[PDB]
Every structure is written in structure tokens, then in C-alpha cells.
């Protein structure tokens, strides 16, 4: 880089690269029917039937 070019002199790079990002994998999820009440209030269900 430039501030090290100020510091010392350079022959050809052996690998030119950047910064990247490291994150995990979701490794699956859980489907319903284990919740299906989510938009509605959890109180009012049977009273129609």
C-alpha cells in the first residue's frame, strides 16, 4: 500500500485480496403447524362453534 510504499519498496504481490464477511448457515428451520394464531389475539377461538 501507499503508506508502506513510503515506508519500504515493493516487488510484485503474491496475492491481492480484500476484506470479506464471515457468517453462519441457518441449517434448517421449523415449519408449522406449531403456531398459526400469530396475527390474532390468543383469547378468542371456540366461541363461533
Amino acid at each position: 500500500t501507499h503508506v508502506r510504499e513510503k515506508a519500504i519498496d515493493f516487488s510484485k504481490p503474491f496475492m491481492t485480496l480484500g476484506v470479506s464477511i464471515l457468517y453462519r448457515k441457518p441449517n434448517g428451520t421449523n415449519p408449522s403447524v406449531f403456531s398459526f394464531l400469530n396475527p390474532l389475539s390468543p383469547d378468542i377461538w371456540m366461541y363461533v362453534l
Partner: peptide
Amino acid sequence: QKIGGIFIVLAAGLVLSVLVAV
């Protein structure tokens, strides 16, 4: 809320249908 206590009008129709005529 918006989700509870709405059932009254059908029982009020029942009152008109049955309660009306004793």
C-alpha cells in the same frame, strides 16, 4: 381490543325471534 366482544347482535336477533313471543 378489536378482537373480542362482538357476538351480541345474533343473540339479540334470537331475543327478537324467541324472546319476542313468550
